[PDB]
């Protein structure tokens, strides 16, 4: 189609390599680039960690409400919310918003922790029909993304699908759905990604993602005023392990999409 030729197009201008895809939940139609390759996930993984959470709290009602503490010892890398509650507490509904919407690697492995392992994340995907994610490491190592590396990653195809089923279906209760909504719409790492190639009166919700090799991230919900949603993963990974972030290509694949309807 014309939308595969200018993503193939963008990804030649771009030096790197490219994965894409769009479900439009009006007519169940999907459009794919390297589909079924797989991808570094870095933080985009945060998303299901988040999810396996709420799905626990399904049965333990009050499991979000728990307070975890933060101790110095827990820091890593990335922490622009943990760091403001060092020697305090967090519960896990702070550290589930602290991942998701500030990308906090802290609260990413208290998460983790939470849930029994990188495995137990895993094991939450394979419960709900993903048997294509793999979460192997914590944080920070889980963004080395080393090229042919099949450790923390997934395929465009299997995060499209993934995300529609935690936002727009049913594999999460009522409520914990339309928190993991909210969590979303309320990131503030995307402006520059996926939100950037869409009409200003879209509603995105997203989860971004970078890690080395120049890999660069997103994924998102989005609702079209007047239309059905749509769910779009940009997957961008480059040679280099130096390379620069290219948030640019993320936009520039959601703008191509968003001509093609
Ligand atoms: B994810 O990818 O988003 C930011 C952090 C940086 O380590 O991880």
Redesign the pocket.
């Known amino acids: 189609s014309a939308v595969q030729q200018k993503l193939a197009a963008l990804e030649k201008s771009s030096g790197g390599r490219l994965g894409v895809a769009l479900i439009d939940t009006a007519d169940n139609t999907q459009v794919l680039y390297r589909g079924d390759e797989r991808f570094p996930m870095?933080?985009?993984s945060?998303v299901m960690a988040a999810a396996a959470v709420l799905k626990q709290s399904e049965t333990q009602k009050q499991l979000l409400n728990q307070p975890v503490e933060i101790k110095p010892a827990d820091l890593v890398?990335?922490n622009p919310i943990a760091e403001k509650h060092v020697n305090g507490t967090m519960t896990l509904a702070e550290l589930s918003a602290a991942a998701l919407q500030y990308?906090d690697?802290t609260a990413?492995n208290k998460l983790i922790a939470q849930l029994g392992g990188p495995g137990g994340v895993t094991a939450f995907a394979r419960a709900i029909g993903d048997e294509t994610f793999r979460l192997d490491r914590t944080?920070?190592t889980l963004?080395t993304a080393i090229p042919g590396d099949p450790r923390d990653t997934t395929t465009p195809r299997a995060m499209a699908q993934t995300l529609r089923q935690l936002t727009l279906g049913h594999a999460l209760g009522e409520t914990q759905r339309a928190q993991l909504v909210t969590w979303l719409k309320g990131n503030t790492?995307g402006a520059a990604s996926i939100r950037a190639g869409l009409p200003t009166s879209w509603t995105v919700g997203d989860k971004?993602?970078?890690?080395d090799y120049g890999?660069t991230?997103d994924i998102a919900v989005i609702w079209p005023q007047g239309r059905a949603p749509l769910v779009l993963v940009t997957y961008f990974t480059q040679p280099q392990q130096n390379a620069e972030s290219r948030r640019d290509v993320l936009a520039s694949a959601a703008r191509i999409i968003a001509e093609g309807l």
């Open positions: 870095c933080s985009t945060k890398n990335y990308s690697n990413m944080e920070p963004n790492t971004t993602g970078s890690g890999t991230n």
